[PDB]
């Protein structure tokens, strides 16, 4: 395939990172 | 590769989904 674990790793990183950003964002947006 | 494409295809769609929310969350924060 080529970059199986590589792409998957980046996907998880970008993902989990997005949820973390959206979490703090929504948590602050909900209050405001 | 047995289910790399399936897992990758899901990771992308799942990641893109969070990206769409990140824009909406940031939009409401930026707009207000």
Curated annotation (Swiss-Prot), chain A:
Please specify the portion of the entire protein covered by the chain, as first and last position out of its full length.
74 to 102 of 160
- Its family? Belongs to the MAX family.
Q: Which domain of life is it from?
A: Eukaryota
Post-translational modification note: Phosphorylated.
Expression is induced as follows: By serum; in 3T3 fibroblasts.
What does the UniProt entry say about where the protein is found? Nucleus; Cell projection, Dendrite
In this UniProt entry, which cysteines form S-S bonds?
A: none
Q: How does it assemble?
A: Efficient DNA binding requires dimerization with another bHLH protein. Binds DNA as a heterodimer with MYC or MAD. Part of the E2F6.com-1 complex in G0 phase composed of E2F6, MGA, MAX, TFDP1, CBX3, BAT8, EUHMTASE1, RING1, RNF2, MBLR, L3MBTL2 and YAF2. Component of some MLL1/MLL complex, at least composed of the core components KMT2A/MLL1, ASH2L, HCFC1/HCF1, WDR5 and RBBP5, as well as the facultative components BACC1, CHD8, E2F6, HSP70, INO80C, KANSL1, LAS1L, MAX, MCRS1, MGA, MYST1/MOF, PELP1, PHF20, PRP31, RING2, RUVB1/TIP49A, RUVB2/TIP49B, SENP3, TAF1, TAF4, TAF6, TAF7, TAF9 and TEX10.
Residue ranges of the region described as Leucine-zipper: 11-32
Mind telling me what this protein is named?
Protein max
What is this protein for, i.e. what is its function? Transcription regulator. Forms a sequence-specific DNA-binding protein complex with MYC or MAD which recognizes the core sequence 5'-CAC[GA]TG-3'. The MYC:MAX complex is a transcriptional activator, whereas the MAD:MAX complex is a repressor. CpG methylation of the recognition site greatly inhibits DNA binding, suggesting that DNA methylation may regulate the MYC:MAX complex in vivo. May repress transcription via the recruitment of a chromatin remodeling complex containing H3 'Lys-9' histone methyltransferase activity. Represses MYC transcriptional activity from E-box elements.
Curated annotation (Swiss-Prot), chain B:
UniProt PTM comment: Phosphorylated by PRKDC. Dephosphorylation at multiple sites by the PNUTS-PP1 complex promotes MYC stability by preventing ubiquitination by the SCF(FBXW7) complex.
Q: Where in the cell is it found?
A: Nucleus, Nucleoplasm; Nucleus, Nucleolus; Nucleus; Cytoplasm
Instruction: Tell me which positions the record assigns to the signal sequence.
Output: none
Please state the biotechnological applications recorded for this protein: POU5F1/OCT4, SOX2, MYC/c-Myc and KLF4 are the four Yamanaka factors. When combined, these factors are sufficient to reprogram differentiated cells to an embryonic-like state designated iPS (induced pluripotent stem) cells. iPS cells exhibit the morphology and growth properties of ES cells and express ES cell marker genes.
The segment annotated Leucine-zipper runs over 11-32
Q: Which domain of life is it from?
A: Eukaryota
What disease is linked with this protein in Swiss-Prot or TrEMBL? A chromosomal aberration involving MYC may be a cause of a form of B-cell chronic lymphocytic leukemia. Translocation t(8;12)(q24;q22) with BTG1.
Instruction: Give a short account of what the protein does.
Output: Transcription factor that binds DNA in a non-specific manner, yet also specifically recognizes the core sequence 5'-CAC[GA]TG-3'. Activates the transcription of growth-related genes. Binds to the VEGFA promoter, promoting VEGFA production and subsequent sprouting angiogenesis. Regulator of somatic reprogramming, controls self-renewal of embryonic stem cells. Functions with TAF6L to activate target gene expression through RNA polymerase II pause release.
The record's domain comment reads: The 9aaTAD motif is a transactivation domain present in a large number of yeast and animal transcription factors.
**How does this chain assemble?**
Efficient DNA binding requires dimerization with another bHLH protein. Binds DNA as a heterodimer with MAX. Interacts with TAF1C and SPAG9. Interacts with PARP10. Interacts with KDM5A and KDM5B. Interacts with PIM2. Interacts with RIOX1. The heterodimer MYC:MAX interacts with ABI1; the interaction may enhance MYC:MAX transcriptional activity. Interacts with TRIM6. Interacts with NPM1; the binary complex is recruited to the promoter of MYC target genes and enhances their transcription.
Q: What else is known?
A: Alternative translation initiation from an upstream, in-frame non-ATG (CTG) codon or a downstream ATG start site results in the production of 2 isoforms with distinct N-termini, shown in this entry as isoforms 2/3 and isoform 1, respectively.
Protein name, please?
Myc proto-oncogene protein
User: Which part of the entire sequence is included in the shown chain?
Assistant: 421 to 449 of 454
């Amino acid at each position: 395939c080529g970059g199986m674990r590589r792409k998957n790793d980046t996907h998880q990183q970008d993902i989990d990172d997005l949820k973390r950003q959206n979490a703090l964002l929504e948590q602050q947006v909900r209050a405001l | 590769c047995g289910g790399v494409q399936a897992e990758e295809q899901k990771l992308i769609s799942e990641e893109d989904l969070l990206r769409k929310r990140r824009e909406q969350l940031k939009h409401k924060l930026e707009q207000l």
